[PDB]
CSV table of C-alpha atoms in Angstrom, one decimal:
chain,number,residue,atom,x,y,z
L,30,UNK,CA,95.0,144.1,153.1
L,31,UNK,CA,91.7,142.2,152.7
L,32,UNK,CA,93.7,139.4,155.0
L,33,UNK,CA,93.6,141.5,157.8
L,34,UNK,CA,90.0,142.8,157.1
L,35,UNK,CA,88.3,139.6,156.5
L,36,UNK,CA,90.2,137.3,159.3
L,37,UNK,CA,90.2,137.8,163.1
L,38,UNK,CA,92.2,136.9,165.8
L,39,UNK,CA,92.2,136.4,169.3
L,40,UNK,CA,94.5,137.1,172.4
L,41,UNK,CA,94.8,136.0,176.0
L,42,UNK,CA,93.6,139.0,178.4
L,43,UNK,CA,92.2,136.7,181.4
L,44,UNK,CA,92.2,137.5,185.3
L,45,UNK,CA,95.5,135.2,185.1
L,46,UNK,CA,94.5,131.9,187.1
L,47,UNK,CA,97.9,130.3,188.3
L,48,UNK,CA,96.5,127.3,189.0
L,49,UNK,CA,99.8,124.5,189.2
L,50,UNK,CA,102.4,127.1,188.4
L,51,UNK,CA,102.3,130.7,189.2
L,52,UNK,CA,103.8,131.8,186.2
L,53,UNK,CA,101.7,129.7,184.2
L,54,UNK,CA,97.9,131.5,183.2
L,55,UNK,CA,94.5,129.3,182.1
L,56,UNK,CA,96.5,130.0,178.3
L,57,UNK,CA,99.5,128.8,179.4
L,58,UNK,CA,102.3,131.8,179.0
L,59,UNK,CA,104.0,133.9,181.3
L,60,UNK,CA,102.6,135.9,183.8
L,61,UNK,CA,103.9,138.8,182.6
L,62,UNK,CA,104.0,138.7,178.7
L,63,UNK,CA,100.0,139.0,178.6
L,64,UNK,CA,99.7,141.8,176.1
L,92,UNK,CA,86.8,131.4,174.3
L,93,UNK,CA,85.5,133.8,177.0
L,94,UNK,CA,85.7,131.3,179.5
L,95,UNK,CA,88.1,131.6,182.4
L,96,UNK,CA,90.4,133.8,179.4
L,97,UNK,CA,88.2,136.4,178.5
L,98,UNK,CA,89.8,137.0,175.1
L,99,UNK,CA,88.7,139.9,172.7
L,100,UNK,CA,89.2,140.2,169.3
L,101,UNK,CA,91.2,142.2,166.7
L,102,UNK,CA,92.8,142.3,162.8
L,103,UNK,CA,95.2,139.9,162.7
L,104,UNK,CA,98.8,140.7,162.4
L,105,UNK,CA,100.7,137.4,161.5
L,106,UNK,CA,99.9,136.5,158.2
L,107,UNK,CA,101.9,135.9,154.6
L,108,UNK,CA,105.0,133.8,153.4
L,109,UNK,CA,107.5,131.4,155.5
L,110,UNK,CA,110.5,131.1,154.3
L,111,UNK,CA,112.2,127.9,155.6
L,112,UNK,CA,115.4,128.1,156.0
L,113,UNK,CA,117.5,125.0,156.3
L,114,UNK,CA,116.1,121.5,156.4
L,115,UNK,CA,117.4,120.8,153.2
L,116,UNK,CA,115.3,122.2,150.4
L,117,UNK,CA,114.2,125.8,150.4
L,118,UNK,CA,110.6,126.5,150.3
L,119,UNK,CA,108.2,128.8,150.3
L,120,UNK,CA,105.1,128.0,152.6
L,121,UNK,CA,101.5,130.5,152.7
L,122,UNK,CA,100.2,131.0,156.2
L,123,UNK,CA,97.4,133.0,158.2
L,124,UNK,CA,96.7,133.4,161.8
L,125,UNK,CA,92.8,133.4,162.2
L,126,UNK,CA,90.3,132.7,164.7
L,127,UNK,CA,89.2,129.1,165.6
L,128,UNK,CA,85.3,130.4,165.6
L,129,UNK,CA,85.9,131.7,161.9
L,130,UNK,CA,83.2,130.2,159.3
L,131,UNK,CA,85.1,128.4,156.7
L,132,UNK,CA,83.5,130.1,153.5
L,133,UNK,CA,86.0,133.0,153.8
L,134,UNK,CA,88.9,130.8,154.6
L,135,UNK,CA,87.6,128.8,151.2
L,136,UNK,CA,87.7,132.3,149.5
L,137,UNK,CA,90.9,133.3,151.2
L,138,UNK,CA,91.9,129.6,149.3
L,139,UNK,CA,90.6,130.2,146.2
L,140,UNK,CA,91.3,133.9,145.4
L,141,UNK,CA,94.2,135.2,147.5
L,142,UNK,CA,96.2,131.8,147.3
L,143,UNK,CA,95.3,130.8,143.2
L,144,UNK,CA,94.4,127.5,144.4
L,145,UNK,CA,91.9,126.2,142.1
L,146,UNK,CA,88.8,123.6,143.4
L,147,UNK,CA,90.9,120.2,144.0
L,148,UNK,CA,89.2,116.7,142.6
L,149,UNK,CA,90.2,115.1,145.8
L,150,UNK,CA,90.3,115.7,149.9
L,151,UNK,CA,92.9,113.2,151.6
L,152,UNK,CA,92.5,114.1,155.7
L,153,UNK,CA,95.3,112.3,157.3
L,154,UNK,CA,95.0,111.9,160.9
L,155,UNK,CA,97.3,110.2,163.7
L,156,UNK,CA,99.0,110.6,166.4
L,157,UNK,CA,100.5,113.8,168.0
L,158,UNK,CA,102.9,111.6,169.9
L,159,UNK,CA,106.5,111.2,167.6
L,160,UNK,CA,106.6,107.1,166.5
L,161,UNK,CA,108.7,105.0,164.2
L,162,UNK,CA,107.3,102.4,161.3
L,163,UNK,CA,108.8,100.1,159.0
L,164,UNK,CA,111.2,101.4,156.9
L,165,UNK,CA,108.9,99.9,153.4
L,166,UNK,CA,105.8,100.6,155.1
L,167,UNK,CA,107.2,104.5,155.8
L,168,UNK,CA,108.0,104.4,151.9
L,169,UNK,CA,105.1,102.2,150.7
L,170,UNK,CA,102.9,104.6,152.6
L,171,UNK,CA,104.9,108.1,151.2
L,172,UNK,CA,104.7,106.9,147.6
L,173,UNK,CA,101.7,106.1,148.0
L,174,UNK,CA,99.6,109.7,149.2
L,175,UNK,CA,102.3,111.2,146.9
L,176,UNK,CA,101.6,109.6,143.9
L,177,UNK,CA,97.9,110.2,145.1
L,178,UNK,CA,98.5,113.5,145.5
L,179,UNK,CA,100.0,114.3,141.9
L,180,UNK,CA,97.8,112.1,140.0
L,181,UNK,CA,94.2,113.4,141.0
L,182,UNK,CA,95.5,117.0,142.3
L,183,UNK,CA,94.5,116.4,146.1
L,184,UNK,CA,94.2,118.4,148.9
L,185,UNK,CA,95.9,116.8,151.8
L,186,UNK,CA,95.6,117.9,155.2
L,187,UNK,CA,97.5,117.5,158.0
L,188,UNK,CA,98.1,118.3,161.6
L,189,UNK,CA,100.7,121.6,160.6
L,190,UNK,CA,102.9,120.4,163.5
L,191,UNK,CA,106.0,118.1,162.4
L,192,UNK,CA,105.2,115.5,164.9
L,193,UNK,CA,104.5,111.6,164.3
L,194,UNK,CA,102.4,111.3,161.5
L,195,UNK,CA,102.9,114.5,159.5
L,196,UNK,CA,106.5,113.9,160.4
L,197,UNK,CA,106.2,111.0,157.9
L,198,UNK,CA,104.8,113.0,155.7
L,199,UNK,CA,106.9,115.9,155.2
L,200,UNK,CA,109.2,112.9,154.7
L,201,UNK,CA,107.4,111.6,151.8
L,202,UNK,CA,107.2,115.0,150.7
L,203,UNK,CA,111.0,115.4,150.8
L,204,UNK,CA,111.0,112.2,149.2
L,205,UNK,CA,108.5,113.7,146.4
L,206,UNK,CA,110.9,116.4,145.2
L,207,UNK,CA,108.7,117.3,141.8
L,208,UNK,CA,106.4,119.5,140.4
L,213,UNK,CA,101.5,120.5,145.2
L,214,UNK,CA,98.7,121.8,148.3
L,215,UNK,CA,99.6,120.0,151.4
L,216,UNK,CA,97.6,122.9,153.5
L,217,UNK,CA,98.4,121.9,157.2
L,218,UNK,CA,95.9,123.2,160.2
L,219,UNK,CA,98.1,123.7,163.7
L,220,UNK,CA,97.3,125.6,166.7
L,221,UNK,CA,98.9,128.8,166.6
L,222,UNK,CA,100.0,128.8,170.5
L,223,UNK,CA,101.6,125.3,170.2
L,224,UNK,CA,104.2,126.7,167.4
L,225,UNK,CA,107.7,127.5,168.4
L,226,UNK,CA,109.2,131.5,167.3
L,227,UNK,CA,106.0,133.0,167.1
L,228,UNK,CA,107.3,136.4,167.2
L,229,UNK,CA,109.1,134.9,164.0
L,230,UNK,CA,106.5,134.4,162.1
L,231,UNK,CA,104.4,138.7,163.0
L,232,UNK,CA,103.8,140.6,159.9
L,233,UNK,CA,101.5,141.7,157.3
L,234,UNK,CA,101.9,140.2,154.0
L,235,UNK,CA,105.5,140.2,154.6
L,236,UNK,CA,108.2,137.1,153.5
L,237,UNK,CA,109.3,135.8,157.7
L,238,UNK,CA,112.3,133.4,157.8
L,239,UNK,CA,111.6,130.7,159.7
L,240,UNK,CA,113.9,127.9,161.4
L,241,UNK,CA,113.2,124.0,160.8
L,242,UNK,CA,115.9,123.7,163.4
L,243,UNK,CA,113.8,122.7,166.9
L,244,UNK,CA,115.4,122.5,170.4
L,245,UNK,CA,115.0,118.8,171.8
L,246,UNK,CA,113.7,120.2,175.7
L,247,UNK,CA,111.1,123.0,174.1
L,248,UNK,CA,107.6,121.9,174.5
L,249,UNK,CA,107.0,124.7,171.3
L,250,UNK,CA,106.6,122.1,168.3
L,251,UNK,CA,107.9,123.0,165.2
L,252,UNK,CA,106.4,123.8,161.6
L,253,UNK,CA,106.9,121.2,159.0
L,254,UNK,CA,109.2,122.4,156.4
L,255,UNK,CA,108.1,120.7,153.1
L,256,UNK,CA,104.1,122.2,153.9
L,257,UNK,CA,102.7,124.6,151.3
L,258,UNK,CA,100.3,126.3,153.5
L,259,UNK,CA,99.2,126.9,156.7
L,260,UNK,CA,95.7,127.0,158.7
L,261,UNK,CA,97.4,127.8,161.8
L,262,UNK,CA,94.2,128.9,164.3
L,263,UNK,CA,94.1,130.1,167.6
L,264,UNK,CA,92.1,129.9,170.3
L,265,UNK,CA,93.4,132.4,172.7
L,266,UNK,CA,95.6,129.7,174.5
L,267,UNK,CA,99.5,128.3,173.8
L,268,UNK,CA,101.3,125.3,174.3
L,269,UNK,CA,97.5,123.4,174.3
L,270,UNK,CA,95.7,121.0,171.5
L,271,UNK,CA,92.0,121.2,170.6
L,272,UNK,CA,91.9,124.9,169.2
L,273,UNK,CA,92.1,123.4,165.3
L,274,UNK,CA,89.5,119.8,164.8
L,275,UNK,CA,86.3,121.9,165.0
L,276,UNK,CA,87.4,124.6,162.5
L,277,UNK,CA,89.4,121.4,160.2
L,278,UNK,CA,86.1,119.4,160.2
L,279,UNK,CA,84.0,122.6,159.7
L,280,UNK,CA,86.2,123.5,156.0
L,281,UNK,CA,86.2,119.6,155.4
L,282,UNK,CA,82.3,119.7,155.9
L,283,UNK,CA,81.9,122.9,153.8
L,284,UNK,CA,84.8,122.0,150.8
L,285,UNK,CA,82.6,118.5,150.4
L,286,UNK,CA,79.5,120.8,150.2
L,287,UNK,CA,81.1,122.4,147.4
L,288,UNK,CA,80.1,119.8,144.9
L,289,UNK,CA,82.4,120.0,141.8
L,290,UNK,CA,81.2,121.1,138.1
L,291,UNK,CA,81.8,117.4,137.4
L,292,UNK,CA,79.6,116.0,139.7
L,293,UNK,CA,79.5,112.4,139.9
L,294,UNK,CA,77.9,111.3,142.8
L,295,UNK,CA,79.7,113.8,145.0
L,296,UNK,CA,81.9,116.8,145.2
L,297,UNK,CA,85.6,117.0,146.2
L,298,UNK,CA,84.7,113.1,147.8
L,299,UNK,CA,86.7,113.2,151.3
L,300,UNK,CA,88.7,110.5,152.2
L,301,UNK,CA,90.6,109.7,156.0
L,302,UNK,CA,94.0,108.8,156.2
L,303,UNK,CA,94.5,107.1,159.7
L,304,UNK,CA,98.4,106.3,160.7
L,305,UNK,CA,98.8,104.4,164.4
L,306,UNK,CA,96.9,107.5,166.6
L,307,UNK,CA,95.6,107.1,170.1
L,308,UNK,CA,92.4,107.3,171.8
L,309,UNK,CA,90.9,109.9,169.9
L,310,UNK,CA,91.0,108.9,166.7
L,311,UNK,CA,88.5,106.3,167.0
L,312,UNK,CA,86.1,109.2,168.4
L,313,UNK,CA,87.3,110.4,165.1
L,314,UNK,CA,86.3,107.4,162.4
L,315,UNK,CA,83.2,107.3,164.7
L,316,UNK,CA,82.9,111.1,163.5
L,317,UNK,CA,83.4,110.4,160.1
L,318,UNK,CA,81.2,107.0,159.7
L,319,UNK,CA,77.9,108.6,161.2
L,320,UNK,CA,77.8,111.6,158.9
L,321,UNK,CA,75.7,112.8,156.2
L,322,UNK,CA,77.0,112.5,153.1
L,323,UNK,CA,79.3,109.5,154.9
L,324,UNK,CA,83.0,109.7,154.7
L,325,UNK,CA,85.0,106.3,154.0
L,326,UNK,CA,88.1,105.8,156.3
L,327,UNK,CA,91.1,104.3,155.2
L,328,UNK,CA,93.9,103.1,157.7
L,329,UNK,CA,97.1,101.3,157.7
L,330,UNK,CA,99.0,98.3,159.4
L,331,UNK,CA,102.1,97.9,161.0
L,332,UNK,CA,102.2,101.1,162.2
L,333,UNK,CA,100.7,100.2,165.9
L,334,UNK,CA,98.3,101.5,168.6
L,335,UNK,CA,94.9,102.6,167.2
L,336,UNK,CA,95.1,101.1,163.7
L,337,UNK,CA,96.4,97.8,164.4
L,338,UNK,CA,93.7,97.3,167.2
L,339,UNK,CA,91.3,98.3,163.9
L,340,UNK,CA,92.8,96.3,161.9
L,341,UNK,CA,92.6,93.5,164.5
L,342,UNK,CA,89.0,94.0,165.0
L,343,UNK,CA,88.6,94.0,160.7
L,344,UNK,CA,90.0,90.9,159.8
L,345,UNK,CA,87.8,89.4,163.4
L,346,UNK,CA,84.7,91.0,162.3
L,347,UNK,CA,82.6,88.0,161.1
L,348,UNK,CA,79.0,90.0,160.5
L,349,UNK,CA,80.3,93.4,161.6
L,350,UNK,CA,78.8,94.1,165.4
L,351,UNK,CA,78.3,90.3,165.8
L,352,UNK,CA,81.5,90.2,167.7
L,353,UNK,CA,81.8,86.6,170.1
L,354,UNK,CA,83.3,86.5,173.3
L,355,UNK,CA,86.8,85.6,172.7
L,356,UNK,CA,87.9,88.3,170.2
L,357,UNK,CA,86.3,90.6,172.9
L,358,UNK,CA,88.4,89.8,175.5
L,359,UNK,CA,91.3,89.4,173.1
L,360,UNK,CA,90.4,93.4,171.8
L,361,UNK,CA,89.9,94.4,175.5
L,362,UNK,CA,93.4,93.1,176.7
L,363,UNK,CA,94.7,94.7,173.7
L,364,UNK,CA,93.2,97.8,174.2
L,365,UNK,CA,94.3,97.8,177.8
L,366,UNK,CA,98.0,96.6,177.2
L,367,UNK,CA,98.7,99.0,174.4
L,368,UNK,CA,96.8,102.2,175.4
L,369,UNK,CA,97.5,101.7,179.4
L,370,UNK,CA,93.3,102.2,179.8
L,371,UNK,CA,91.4,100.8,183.1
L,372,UNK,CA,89.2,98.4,182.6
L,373,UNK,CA,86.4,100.9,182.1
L,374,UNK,CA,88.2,102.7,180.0
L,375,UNK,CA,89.0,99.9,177.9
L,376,UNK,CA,85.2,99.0,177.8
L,377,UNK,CA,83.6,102.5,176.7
L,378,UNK,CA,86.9,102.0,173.7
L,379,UNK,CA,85.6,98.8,172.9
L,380,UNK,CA,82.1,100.2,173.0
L,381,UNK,CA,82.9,102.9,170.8
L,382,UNK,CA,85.2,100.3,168.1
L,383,UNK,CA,81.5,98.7,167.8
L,384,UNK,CA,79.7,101.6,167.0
L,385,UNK,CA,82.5,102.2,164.7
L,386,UNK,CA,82.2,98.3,163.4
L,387,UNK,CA,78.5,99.1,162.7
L,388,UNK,CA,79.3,100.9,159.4
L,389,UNK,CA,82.1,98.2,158.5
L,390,UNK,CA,82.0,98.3,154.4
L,391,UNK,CA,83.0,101.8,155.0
L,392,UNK,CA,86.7,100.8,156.3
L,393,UNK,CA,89.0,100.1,153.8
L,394,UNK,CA,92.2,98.4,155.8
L,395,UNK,CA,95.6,98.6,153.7
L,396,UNK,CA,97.3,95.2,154.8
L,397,UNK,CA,101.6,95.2,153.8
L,398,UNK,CA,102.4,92.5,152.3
L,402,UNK,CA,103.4,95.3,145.0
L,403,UNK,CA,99.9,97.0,146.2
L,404,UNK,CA,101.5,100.2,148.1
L,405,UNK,CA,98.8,102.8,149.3
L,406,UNK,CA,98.0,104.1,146.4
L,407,UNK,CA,95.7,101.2,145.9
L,408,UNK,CA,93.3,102.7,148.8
L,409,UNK,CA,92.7,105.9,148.8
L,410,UNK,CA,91.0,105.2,145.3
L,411,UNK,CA,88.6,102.6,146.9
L,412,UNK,CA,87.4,105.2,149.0
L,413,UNK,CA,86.9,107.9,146.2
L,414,UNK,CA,84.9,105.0,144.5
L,415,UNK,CA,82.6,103.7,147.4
L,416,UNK,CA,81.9,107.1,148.6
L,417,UNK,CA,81.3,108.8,145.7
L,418,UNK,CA,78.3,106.1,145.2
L,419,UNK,CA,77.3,106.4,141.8
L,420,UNK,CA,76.6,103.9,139.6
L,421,UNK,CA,79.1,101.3,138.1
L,422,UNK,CA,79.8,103.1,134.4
L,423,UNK,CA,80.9,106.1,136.1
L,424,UNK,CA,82.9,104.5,138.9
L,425,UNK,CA,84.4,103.3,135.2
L,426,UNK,CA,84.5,106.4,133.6
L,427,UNK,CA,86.2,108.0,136.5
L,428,UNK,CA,88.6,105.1,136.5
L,429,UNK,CA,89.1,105.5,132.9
L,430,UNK,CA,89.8,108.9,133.4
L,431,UNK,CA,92.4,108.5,135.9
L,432,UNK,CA,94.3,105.6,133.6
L,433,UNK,CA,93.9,103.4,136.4
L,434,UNK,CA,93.1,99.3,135.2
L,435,UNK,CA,93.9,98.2,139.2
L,436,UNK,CA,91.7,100.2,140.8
J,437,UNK,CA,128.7,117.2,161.3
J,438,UNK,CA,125.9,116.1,159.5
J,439,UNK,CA,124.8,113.7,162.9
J,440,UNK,CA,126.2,115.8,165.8
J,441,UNK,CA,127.2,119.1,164.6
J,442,UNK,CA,124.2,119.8,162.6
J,443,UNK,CA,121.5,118.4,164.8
J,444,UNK,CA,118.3,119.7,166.7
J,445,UNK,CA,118.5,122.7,169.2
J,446,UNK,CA,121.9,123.5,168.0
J,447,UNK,CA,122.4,127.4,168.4
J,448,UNK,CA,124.6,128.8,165.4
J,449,UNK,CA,126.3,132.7,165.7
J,450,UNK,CA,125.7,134.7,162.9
J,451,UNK,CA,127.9,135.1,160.2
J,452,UNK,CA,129.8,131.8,161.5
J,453,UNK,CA,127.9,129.8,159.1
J,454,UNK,CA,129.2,131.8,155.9
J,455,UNK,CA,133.0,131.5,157.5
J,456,UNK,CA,132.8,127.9,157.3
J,457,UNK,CA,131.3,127.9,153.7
J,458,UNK,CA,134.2,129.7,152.8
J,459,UNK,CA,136.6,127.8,154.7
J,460,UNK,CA,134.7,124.9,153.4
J,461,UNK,CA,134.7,126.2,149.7
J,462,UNK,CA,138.6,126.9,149.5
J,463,UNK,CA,139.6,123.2,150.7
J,464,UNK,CA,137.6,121.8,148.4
J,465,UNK,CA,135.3,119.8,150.3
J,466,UNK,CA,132.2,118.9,148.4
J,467,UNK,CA,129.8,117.1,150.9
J,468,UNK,CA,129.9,120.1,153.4
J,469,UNK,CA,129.3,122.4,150.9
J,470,UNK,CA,126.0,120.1,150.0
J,471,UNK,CA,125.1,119.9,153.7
J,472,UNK,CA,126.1,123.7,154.3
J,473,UNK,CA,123.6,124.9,151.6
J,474,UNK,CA,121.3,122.2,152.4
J,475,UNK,CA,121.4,124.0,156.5
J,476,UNK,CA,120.0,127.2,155.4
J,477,UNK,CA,122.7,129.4,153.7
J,478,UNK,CA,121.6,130.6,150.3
J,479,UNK,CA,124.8,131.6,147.8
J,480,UNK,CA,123.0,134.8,146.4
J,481,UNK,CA,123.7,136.3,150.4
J,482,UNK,CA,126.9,135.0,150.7
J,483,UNK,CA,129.1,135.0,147.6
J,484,UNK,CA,130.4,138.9,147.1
């Protein structure tokens, strides 16, 4: 009952602007199944979808927390909500994995590589990792590797609420809501990953749209980091950022994460394509970070405009923005393939970020039985 | 079935399911069984 207390939510009553489609409102639903303040108008209320998914098919059963709140929520109660009603205790470790929302296809070894690698991550420091919620492209891979796992887990995922499919499914009050993994190929409505153990799911007001989640996902990220653990060497919970292919926005992202105080290290991956091999591409032509010469310009600005299908404008302000990026380079770790998997990353960035001095870098090391890292 | 049968947007009726877990259980066929309960149906709601 203190879910419904404590959390708010929000719903679409709006002057319902047609705009393209008739039926189709500023939030996106039917013009008839109505019932920010901007052009919607919303107002708020208890919330009334909250409790336990039960996933049903898709292989393993499995139980998965969730809560409707409102993207404007501070993220000290949702911590309390994380710590208290859900018994998770403080993790040693935040892994935010970012990508693309578009569906893609890797490597098979670089798919498994990559897997084993945040999963044995994820068991051996008791990590948080966070995800998109949605089981598209990048957290499609991994609710692989988490099928893949199949032992002993907090793999809290953060979706819009609108963009979910059933969500008349998922209404109730602390009540256990069977939910199906099975998605239909034509529905826009994306579907909830089925090997998740919670859910952030936020909305806005609107459905079917992004962009109602990355404030209040980098808001708990900024406040669980704040939360400096009893430990505290150097840092607290240190935050590292998993990048897999992406688009245009998650440079705007790194970008984000670089120019922040305390700074966050970024981690990506190769082979994957788009965003991260354009990264990569500008890492390994780097020579003194922003002193980029004319040729690997050029090269990064056809690349940019190949892959991405950008103007030549567009391309520029990219490029622009891949330098102020390249500014902080000994930030950006770059996991090459081609025996090191992933999990030989991640750590790196736990180390650099956490900046303290060498013995604890080797006590924590030592702690962690790690002699690679 | 695993490929076709069992693929995305694929409506199922109710109760259908649990009449092919029993047809599947008396011919002794092992793999759809595995795939059945691995699709969603649980044996404490079905066996009676």
């Amino acid at each position: 009952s203190w879910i419904e207390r404590a959390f708010y939510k929000r719903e679409c009553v709006h002057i319902i602007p047609s705009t393209k489609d008739p039926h189709r409102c500023c939030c996106g639903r039917l013009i008839g199944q109505h019932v920010w303040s901007i052009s919607k108008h919303t107002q708020l209320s208890p919330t009334d979808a909250f409790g336990t998914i039960e996933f049903q098919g898709g292989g393993h059963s499995n139980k998965a927390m969730y809560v409707r709140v409102s993207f404007d929520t501070k993220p000290d109660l949702l911590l309390h909500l994380m710590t208290k009603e859900w018994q998770l205790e403080l993790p040693k470790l935040l892994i935010s994995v970012h990508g693309g929302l578009q569906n893609f296809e890797l490597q098979p070894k670089l798919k498994q590589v990559f897997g084993k690698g945040l999963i044995k991550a994820a068991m051996t420091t008791g990590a948080w990792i966070f995800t998109g919620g949605v089981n598209t492209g990048v957290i499609r891979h991994v609710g692989d590797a988490l099928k893949d796992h199949a032992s002993k887990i907090c793999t809290i995922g953060i979706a819009p609420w609108g963009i979910v499919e059933n969500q008349e499914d998922l209404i109730g009050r602390d009540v256990v809501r069977p939910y199906q993994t099975m998605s239909n190929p034509m529905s826009k409505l994306t579907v909830l990953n089925s090997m998740h153990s919670h859910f952030i799911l936020a909305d806005n007001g609107t459905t079917g749209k992004y962009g109602a989640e990355v404030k209040l996902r980098r808001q708990l990220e900024k406040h669980i980091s704040l939360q400096k653990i009893n430990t505290r060497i150097g840092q607290g919970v240190p935050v590292v950022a998993l990048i897999v292919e992406g688009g245009p926005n998650v440079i705007s992202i790194v970008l984000e994460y670089l120019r922040d105080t305390p700074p966050v290290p970024v981690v990506v991956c190769d082979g994957s394509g788009r965003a991260s091999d354009i990264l990569a591409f500008g890492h390994k032509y780097s020579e003194e970070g922003g002193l980029i010469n004319e040729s690997l310009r050029d090269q990064l600005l056809v690349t940019i405009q190949k892959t991405f299908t950008y103007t030549r404008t567009q391309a520029q302000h990219l490029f622009i923005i891949l330098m102020e990026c390249m500014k902080k380079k000994e930030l950006i770790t770059v996991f090459r393939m081609g025996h090191q998997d992933i999990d030989l990353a991640i750590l790196t960035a736990l180390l650099k970020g956490a900046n303290a001095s060498a013995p604890d870098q080797l006590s924590l090391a030592l702690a962690w039985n790690r002699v690679d890292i | 079935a695993r490929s076709q049968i069992f693929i995305y947007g694929q409506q199922w009726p109710v109760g259908s399911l649990e009449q092919a877990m029993l047809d599947a259980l008396v011919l002794d066929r092992v793999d759809f069984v595995k795939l059945l309960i691995e699709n969603g149906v649980s044996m404490h709601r079905f066996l009676t």
